[PDB]
Design a protein around this ligand. Structure first.
Ligand SMILES: NC(=O)[C@H](CCC(=O)O)NC(=O)[C@H](CCC(=O)O)NC(=O)CCc1ccc(-c2cc(-c3ccccc3)cs2)cc1
Ligand SMILES: [Ca+2]
Ligand SMILES: [Ca+2]
Ligand SMILES: [Ca+2]
Ligand SMILES: [Zn+2]
Ligand SMILES: [Zn+2]
Length: 159
């Protein structure tokens, strides 16, 4: 097992915005992704626009300051650090991907759901129907729901 936030009130901040999408559409995708996890836990998420946040959201390309360089278009889409101080919790998205509000390119909302799972301390699921399954695939975003496995996983960390 890994680490967890030793608190239930968790802040996030968007460091910077992909030019792929409009600013409002980015904020929304991220907000809705946090809400997915909020809906099945006691966790409360708050966006801040300046200052120290628990989870920093970053778009960057190639080698971008950690031990985990991105790899251009395709392959790695994003990654996130487990709960902890400093870079802990932070979620990074590869700017070399084309981020979208829909099924075009790589869907930011679905990807954020997956990465925030990691930011909260989840690992991967062996269940192909779970959002924490290790590879991207588009599913209808209006009908999207966490799988029972995702809910089991997150509730085992936060009660
Ligand atoms: N070359 C690679 O692709 C490597 C290989 C994996 C490894 O060995 O680390 N991947 C990597 O390095 C990184 C690691 C970071 C992470 O895992 O988040 N992974 C990645 O870059 C991929 C991260 C990702 C994983 C899953 C999803 C999604 C799943 C779903 C979904 C919805 C319903 C049902 C089923 C699925 C919607 S969206 C989105 C994004
Ligand atoms: Ca990539
Ligand atoms: Ca952090
Ligand atoms: Ca891009
Ligand atoms: Zn990174
Ligand atoms: Zn993952």
């Amino acid at each position: 097992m890994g680490p967890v936030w030793r608190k239930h009130y968790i802040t996030y901040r968007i460091n910077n915005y992909t030019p792929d999408m409009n600013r409002e559409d980015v904020d929304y995708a991220i907000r809705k992704a946090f809400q997915v996890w909020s809906n099945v836990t006691p966790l409360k998420f708050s966006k801040i626009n300046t200052g120290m946040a628990d989870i920093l959201v970053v778009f960057a390309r190639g080698a971008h300051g950690d031990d985990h360089a991105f790899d251009g278009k395709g392959g790695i889409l994003a990654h996130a650090f487990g709960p902890g101080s400093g870079i802990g919790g932070d979620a990074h998205f590869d700017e070399d991907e084309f981020w979208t509000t829909h099924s075009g390119g790589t869907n930011l909302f679905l990807t954020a759901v997956h990465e925030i799972g990691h930011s909260l301390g989840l690992g991967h699921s062996s269940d192909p129907k779970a959002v924490m399954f290790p590879t991207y695939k588009y599913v209808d975003i209006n009908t999207f729901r966490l799988s029972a496995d995702d809910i089991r996983g997150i509730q085992s960390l936060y009660g």
